[PDB]
Design a protein around this ligand. Sequence first.
Ligand SMILES: *[C@@H]1O[C@H](CO)[C@@H](O)[C@H](O)[C@H]1NC(C)=O
Ligand SMILES: *[C@@H]1O[C@H](CO)[C@@H](O)[C@H](O)[C@H]1NC(C)=O
Ligand SMILES: *[C@@H]1O[C@H](CO)[C@@H](O)[C@H](O)[C@H]1NC(C)=O
Ligand SMILES: *[C@@H]1O[C@H](CO)[C@@H](O)[C@H](O)[C@H]1NC(C)=O
Ligand SMILES: *[C@@H]1O[C@H](CO)[C@@H](O)[C@H](O)[C@H]1NC(C)=O
Lengths: 222, 417, 209
Amino acid sequence: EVKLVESGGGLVKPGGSLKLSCAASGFSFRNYAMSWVRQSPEKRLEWVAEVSSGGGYTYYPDTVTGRFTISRDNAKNILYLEMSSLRSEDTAMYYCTRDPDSSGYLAWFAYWGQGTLVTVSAASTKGPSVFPLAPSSKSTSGGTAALGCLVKDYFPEPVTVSWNSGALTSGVHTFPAVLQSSGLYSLSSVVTVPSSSLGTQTYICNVNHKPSNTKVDKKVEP
Amino acid sequence: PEGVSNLVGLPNNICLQKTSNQILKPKLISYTLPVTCITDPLLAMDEGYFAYSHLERIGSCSRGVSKQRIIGVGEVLDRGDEVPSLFMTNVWTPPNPNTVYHCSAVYNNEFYYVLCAVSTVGDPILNSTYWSGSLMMTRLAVKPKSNGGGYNQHQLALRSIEKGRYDKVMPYGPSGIKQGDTLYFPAVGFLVRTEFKYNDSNCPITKCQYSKPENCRLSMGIRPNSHYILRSGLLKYNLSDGENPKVVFIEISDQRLSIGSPSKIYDSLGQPVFYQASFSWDTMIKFGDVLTVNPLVVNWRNNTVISRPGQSQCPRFNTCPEICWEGVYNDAFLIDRINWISAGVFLDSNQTAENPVFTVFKDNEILYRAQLASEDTNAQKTITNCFLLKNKIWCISLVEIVIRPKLFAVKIPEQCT
Amino acid sequence: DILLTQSPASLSASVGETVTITCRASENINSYLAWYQQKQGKSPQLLVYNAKTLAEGVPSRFSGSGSDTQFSLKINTLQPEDFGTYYCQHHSGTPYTFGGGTKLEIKRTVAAPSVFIFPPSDEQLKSGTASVVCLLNNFYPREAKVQWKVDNALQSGNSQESVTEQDSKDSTYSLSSTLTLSKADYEKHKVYACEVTHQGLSSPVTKSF
Ligand SMILES: *[C@@H]1O[C@H](CO)[C@@H](O)[C@H](O)[C@H]1NC(C)=O
Ligand SMILES: *[C@@H]1O[C@H](CO)[C@@H](O)[C@H](O)[C@H]1NC(C)=O
Ligand SMILES: *[C@@H]1O[C@H](CO)[C@@H](O)[C@H](O)[C@H]1NC(C)=O
Ligand SMILES: *[C@@H]1O[C@H](CO)[C@@H](O)[C@H](O)[C@H]1NC(C)=O
Ligand SMILES: *[C@@H]1O[C@H](CO)[C@@H](O)[C@H](O)[C@H]1NC(C)=O
């Protein structure tokens, strides 16, 4: 079962450097070429790096040439992407991909990792406050009551919201983050429940902001 | 849209106030369908098409000789005077009429699918410990073609059944819904009584001086020592799940839990609605919007005016937990969600099943009613579906009345006079 | 470089309907064109490669054709999980380039939204700012107009909107709007109203506090 796992993405100041890594399992890594592909905030997809299976042959677009460097360890089954002189316009999600054959060049990507997010930004990480969204009794249109969490004033993306540690999924709507005029992100995660469960089932929202080493669990109560 | 359309969007206003006025004028539309005795009616309606089923039996409507199963589909046309009627288009009759049970119908994209139980051991509800789990699923073209072959009528392969902790699952209700290419039929799960997890402290007996905390758990089956309990729910058919998709059971939540009874999921105003017959001590109507289809969670109404006749142990308006399996299916169809107004045919008598009245109601207020007959006339089952014609809310009720079914078309009136 | 131009920009079709997207290479790319579907915050999923070859476990309701400069993808028997953005990539050699994308929404019957209004939490008020939250729940079409008036005063530029992505099983959206004001401006007013205009609401609905 093919698996690629990005890691090492983060917040970097315009001009700094980073080394992303991708662990690979589920296929003979050493006989395949690999590629790095990124996705801009505006969601345009953009190819970044290709390396032969041997690791001798590396290919790059003009836009990252001489700043990025694709590398590979066929012993530990790991692919790397050394990025330097980072510009604000390389803020992107970074996927490591498998090529279909050993030398590449005419390659589509059947396998992508989950991505790792690089933010090239002057700004400083700031962890969020997570506030209870109170169910009121004005809520109870049709007998369903809505409760949630406001994850507010943090930087950079991402944060993760769970409910009841993953036990609670149906009804949940974790919204995309919004970039406030203050320049921090804010998102809201709601779940709709039987108004009859309000008194008898406690709902605990699990926020995790990996950059700032935050996790909170604000219990939403009626 | 043209002709008959589902109840969606912003329909023409309806009379929103309680009135003893005679503003409902039902119309007997039975004449456009097949007439011995006739039990086990099915009436499903959707997107201008309908599905109908019954079993014509010889003499006795309880144990007579099973003459014929009729499983038929058709279109709901404006019959010529702005009144809707059912016009059959395609009829299928099983080879063995007495091995087909508890048929349930769902429309999707110019096919009715109908899910029935196959049993050589009787009504599975009554001989469950001996019923093979088997299910039959028929797809009917609503508008067949000349040499249509498999398109006109096709018997789909019910290979696998995913049923969780349930011994056997079965359809149990007239009509279901579609979401994309997934059919949800209304179903029942047979559960071995000894695995049934129940908190007797949640049986509600406070003002019930002759009850006991454990009647609920006990009357979750057809006898208090019954081998199975019946939990109502959904049977899920995913039409894009390969060659022969499986059926998957979805149980209904534990909220306001009552014996598995014949139930119904239907769309109204863009969102699904659920109805469960009150076949037990909880005799106040059980219906409300689906909060989520899966797991099945139903925002039950706190309805205080509509019920069903029952026998002497759990009569009409009984609320106290009792050991009883008695009642009739008298469904209702939500016609207005902002005000939660609904229509159905209920029987106005306490312990006798008689006097069918088409009724438009709120949670705790009947708005306006209209007898379909005399107070003497015995009715049993009622199935009501509502829809748009030239943007006007109409309802078609099948009302059982020996016993044969008779169809009424009742337009929901706009003025209150 | 190679330029891929996808048409149309976006697209809305009912379940069951057949859909088709076209992609046009700036220059001959043989049959070295690939197709991906991407939903929210996930790596794009390969549908077609070599213009016409389906990827492993891709439903056969997906076909692709083309050669030279023009290609297209077909989805017949559209499915509620077929929503997302569909990109074409060429693999005629490096640099690989993608197309701008085609956004596919699933078309369904109208559906009016439930509305719930959330009052700023005490915890948050101790900090010196108040955000009130409105949730439009499971509605279709996407297009809604949410408005905050504060004391029948139409608010503007103090509000932000975030929309769920189309639901996988029933093609409904959800909306949250956040009205954000300081603990001072929050003391100052009485009416805190959320007003929702939608296709399935004859009259705008308002929840408030
Ligand atoms: C019904 O009543 C219960 C409390 O008795 C309440 O929690 C529930 O929300 C009500 N449901 C509706 C649809 O009004
Ligand atoms: C159930 O089926 C078994 C097997 O045919 C039979 O012994 C039993 O009498 C049946 N019970 C009924 C028909 O009530
Ligand atoms: C069942 O519910 C009652 C009501 O609170 C509780 O006291 C009892 O202990 C419960 N039993 C369980 C959870 O086993
Ligand atoms: C139906 O099946 C397809 C593939 O088997 C799946 O993608 C889709 O989510 C399913 N729909 C359901 C389970 O409602
Ligand atoms: C008979 O009907 C009346 C309505 O006047 C109702 O209040 C009463 O509870 C019913 N009696 C029984 C035994 O159900």
